[PDB]
Design a protein around this ligand. Structure first.
Ligand SMILES: NC(=O)C1=CN([C@@H]2O[C@H](COP(=O)(O)OP(=O)(O)OC[C@H]3O[C@@H](n4cnc5c(N)ncnc54)[C@H](OP(=O)(O)O)[C@@H]3O)[C@@H](O)[C@H]2O)C=CC1
Ligand SMILES: C[C@H]1CCc2c(N)nc(N)nc2C1
Ligand SMILES: [Ca+2]
Ligand SMILES: [Ca+2]
Ligand SMILES: [Cl-]
Length: 159
């Protein structure tokens, strides 16, 4: 099973100048709980954006060029990335926009954080067909002293 996990601001904006411009510790905890002990696939720009390996997860980086860090696994295609995960119950695709576009048709599950934030970005999550996905989990949260926006954690399953 292939899953995508992403935090979406308004208009499906997911990034700006290689950053995710919002401060939501509750999203980092959600991201951590849903990806720990599962292989994570990311594009080279997301690898550079995160800046270091994610502990407790096999890190697989997509790049058309050779790798530049042996603390992680480097791959040159979507099928090679999936193969490098091995026989596991769930693969987590963690970004960015270009990597999401390629794995979306292969994915069975979406873990989305809908953030009520206005962000002028340069990266978007794919324009997924709403008819093809069913909501199986939704939990809304109002902003608090630690999280500057209201946000909703949603899990979608391919119909
Ligand atoms: N809000 C959220 O949940 C998240 C947001 N982001 C944001 O997304 C942005 C990064 O996204 P984006 O710019 O689209 O870049 P990506 O992170 O998707 O990386 C794209 C790079 O990955 C490599 N790649 C992708 N597909 C393949 C393939 N099939 N075969 C070989 N190599 C491949 C290429 O590297 P090369 O050029 O070396 O060939 C390409 O340039 C940042 O702003 C980041 O902050 C990222 C993760 C989560
Ligand atoms: C630290 C970043 C890493 C990538 C990521 C993602 N793919 N999905 C969600 N909901 N949050 C994050 C936080
Ligand atoms: Ca193979
Ligand atoms: Ca807001
Ligand atoms: Cl984490």
């Amino acid at each position: 099973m292939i899953s995508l996990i992403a935090a979406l601001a308004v208009d499906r904006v997911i990034g700006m100048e290689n950053a995710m411009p919002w401060n939501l510790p509750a999203d980092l905890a959600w991201f951590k709980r849903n990806t720990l002990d599962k292989p994570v696939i990311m594009g080279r720009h997301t690898w550079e954006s995160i800046g270091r390996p994610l502990p407790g997860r096999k890190n697989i980086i997509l790049s058309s060029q050779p790798g530049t860090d042996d603390r992680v696994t480097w791959v040159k295609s979507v099928d090679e990335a999936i193969a490098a995960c091995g026989d596991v119950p769930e693969i987590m695709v963690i970004g960015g926009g270009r990597v999401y576009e390629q794995f979306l048709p292969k994915a069975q599950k979406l873990y989305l954080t809908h953030i009520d934030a206005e962000v002028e970005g340069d990266t978007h999550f794919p324009d997924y067909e709403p008819d093809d996905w069913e909501s199986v989990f939704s939990e809304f949260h109002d902003a608090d002293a630690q999280n500057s926006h209201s946000y909703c954690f949603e899990i979608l399953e391919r119909r």
